[PDB]
Design an enzyme around this catalytic site. Structure first.
Site, PDB file in Angstrom:
ATOM      1  CE  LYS A  20      -0.643   3.531   3.148  1.00  0.00           C
ATOM      2  NZ  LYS A  20      -0.627   2.276   3.968  1.00  0.00           N
ATOM      3  CB  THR A  21       2.012   0.354   7.125  1.00  0.00           C
ATOM      4  OG1 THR A  21       0.665   0.831   7.158  1.00  0.00           O
ATOM      5  CG2 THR A  21       2.676   0.623   8.460  1.00  0.00           C
ATOM      6  N   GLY A  22       3.017  -0.739   4.399  1.00  0.00           N
ATOM      7  CA  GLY A  22       2.674  -1.558   3.253  1.00  0.00           C
ATOM      8  C   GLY A  22       2.888  -3.029   3.543  1.00  0.00           C
ATOM      9  CB  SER A  23       1.333  -5.719   4.682  1.00  0.00           C
ATOM     10  OG  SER A  23       1.957  -5.172   5.830  1.00  0.00           O
TER      11      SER A  23
ATOM     12  CE1 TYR B 245      -4.744   2.086   4.365  1.00  0.00           C
ATOM     13  CE2 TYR B 245      -4.573  -0.202   3.647  1.00  0.00           C
ATOM     14  CZ  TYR B 245      -4.047   1.078   3.735  1.00  0.00           C
ATOM     15  OH  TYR B 245      -2.823   1.365   3.196  1.00  0.00           O
TER      16      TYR B 245
ATOM     17  CB  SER C 295      -0.939   0.006   1.198  1.00  0.00           C
ATOM     18  OG  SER C 295      -1.910  -1.018   1.092  1.00  0.00           O
TER      19      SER C 295
ATOM     20  CE  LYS D 255      -3.677   0.994  -0.806  1.00  0.00           C
ATOM     21  NZ  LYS D 255      -4.534   0.693   0.378  1.00  0.00           N
TER      22      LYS D 255
ATOM     23  CD  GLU E 125      -1.964   5.913   7.129  1.00  0.00           C
ATOM     24  OE1 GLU E 125      -1.188   5.447   7.992  1.00  0.00           O
ATOM     25  OE2 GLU E 125      -2.628   5.188   6.354  1.00  0.00           O
TER      26      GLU E 125
END
Length: 349
Positions: free
Chosen positions: A304-307, A139, A61, A64, A261
C-alpha cells in the site's frame, strides 16, 4: 547482519533522499521475522533534529489499512457485515444511490464514482454515481472515509477512540495516533512539499479514517509483523487482520483486497510498476469481481502507498517469506521510486 542489512538499505535510500531532497527517512525491515529500524537524516530543516525511534510521520492513505482492519474486526465480532449497505447505518440515505453502497464497495474503491455531519448526510444524499457499485475501481477518500465512519457506527463508538483505545494497543502500537497528544507534538516530523515548503496536515471531513494516522517506523513495522501473524495478537484480531488480505477484484494488473493491494508472489517489477502507476491512482479502472473471493494467500506481494502534502509512505510484505519493508519520508518521493527500492531491498533478503 544489521551491518550488512543497513548497508543494503543505505545504498537505496541515500541516493533517493539525495535526488529528491528528502530531509529524513525511517526504514523498517522484517528479515526472517526479525525487525530492524534504520533512521536517516533530520525531522525538520528549521530545527535540524534527527530522525529517531519516536519520530512521527504522516502515512497518508496507508491509514486506510488500519481502518480496514478495524472494519474486519467488527465483521469478525458480528457487529457488521461487509455486505451491509451504507443505508443500514445512515437511515436517511435509504432510497438514495449511496444507501445501497456496501461496506465492501467502500473498502475496495468500487462504490461507483466520486464541515458538520448534517452536511455530510446532505452530500451523500445528492451523490449520483458514475458507475454501478462494484464495477469500477476509482481511488477516493470518500469511499474509505465512509468505511471508517460506518464501522464506528456499527461498533457503538467514536472513531478516533476505537483506533487509539482498541486497535493500536491491541497491536502494541504505542506511538501511533489519530490525534497527536501534546506531550508528543515534539516527536512530529515536519513535512515538505515538492518545492521544499514546510507543511503538515489539513484535516478535511472523514480525515481520520482516510489519512489521519501519524506513526513511527517501529509501530508500522509491528503492524506488518501482525499482518504475517508473528506477534501473538489475540485470536479475533488475528483472524480480522488476515481477512483484510481477501482478494475481491481484479483491476488491470492489481488485485484489490480490503484496502490492501496484492500480486502473486514471486512478482516481476513491471507488475508492481503497472499496479502503482498513476493510471491506477486517478482513473476509473474496470474492476472484475473475483467469485469466490481469493482466500488470504501467503504467496503474495501485499502493499500500500501513502502520500500527503509533505510525506511519502510505502509498505510491502510477503507472508510466505516472512519479510517486509516500511518506508517513511518527510518529503515527496515518486511512488514508483519507493516501489523500486523496496523491490531491490527485499530482493536482497
Amino acid at each position: 547482519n544489521a551491518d550488512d542489512l543497513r548497508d543494503t538499505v543505505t545504498r537505496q535510500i541515500a541516493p533517493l533522499m539525495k535526488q529528491y531532497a528528502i530531509p529524513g527517512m525511517a526504514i523498517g525491515i522484517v528479515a526472517d521475522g526479525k525487525p530492524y529500524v534504520f533512521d536517516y537524516g533530520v525531522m525538520s530543516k528549521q530545527t535540524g533534529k534527527p530522525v529517531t525511534g519516536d519520530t512521527l510521520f504522516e502515512i497518508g492513505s496507508v491509514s486506510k489499512t488500519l481502518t480496514a482492519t478495524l472494519a474486519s474486526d467488527a465483521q469478525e465480532g458480528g457487529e457488521l457485515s461487509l455486505a451491509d449497505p451504507a443505508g443500514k447505518y445512515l437511515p436517511e440515505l435509504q432510497g438514495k444511490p449511496f444507501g445501497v453502497v456496501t461496506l465492501l464497495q467502500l473498502g475496495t474503491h468500487t462504490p461507483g464514482g466520486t464541515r458538520d455531519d448534517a452536511g455530510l448526510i446532505r452530500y451523500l444524499d445528492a451523490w449520483r454515481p458514475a458507475y454501478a457499485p462494484g464495477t469500477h475501481r476509482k481511488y477516493s477518500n470518500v469511499a474509505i472515509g465512509m468505511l471508517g465512519w460506518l464501522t464506528a457506527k456499527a461498533m457503538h463508538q467514536d472513531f478516533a477512540t476505537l483506533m487509539e483505545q482498541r486497535l493500536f494497543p491491541a497491536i502494541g502500537m504505542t506511538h501511533t495516533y489519530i490525534n497527536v497528544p501534546a506531550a508528543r507534538m515534539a516527536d512530529y516530523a515536519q513535512g515538505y512539499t515538492k518545492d521544499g515548503k514546510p507543511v503538515r496536515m489539513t484535516e478535511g471531513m472523514l480525515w481520520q479514517p482516510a489519512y489521519g494516522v501519524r506513526t513511527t517506523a517501529a509501530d508500522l513495522l509491528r503492524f506488518v509483523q501482525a499482518n504475517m501473524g508473528m506477534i501473538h495478537t489475540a485470536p479475533r484480531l488475528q483472524r480480522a487482520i488476515e481477512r483484510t488480505h481477501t482478494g475481491y477484484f481484479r483491476a488491470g494488473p492489481l488485485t484489490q483486497d480490503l484496502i490492501w493491494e496484492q500480486y502473486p508472489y514471486p512478482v516481476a517489477l513491471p507488475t508492481l510498476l503497472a499496479g502503482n502507476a498513476p493510471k491506477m491512482l486517478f482513473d476509473a479502472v474496470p474492476a472484475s469481481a473475483i467469485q469466490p473471493p481469493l482466500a488470504p494467500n501467503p504467496a503474495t506481494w501485499i502493499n500500500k502507498t501513502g502520500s500527503t502534502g509533505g510525506f511519502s509512505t510505502y509498505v510491502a510484505f510477503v507472508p510466505a517469506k516472512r519479510i517486509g519493508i516500511v518506508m517513511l519520508a518527510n518529503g515527496n518521493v515518486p511512488i514508483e521510486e519507493r516501489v523500486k527500492a523496496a523491490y531491490r531491498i527485499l530482493g536482497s533478503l
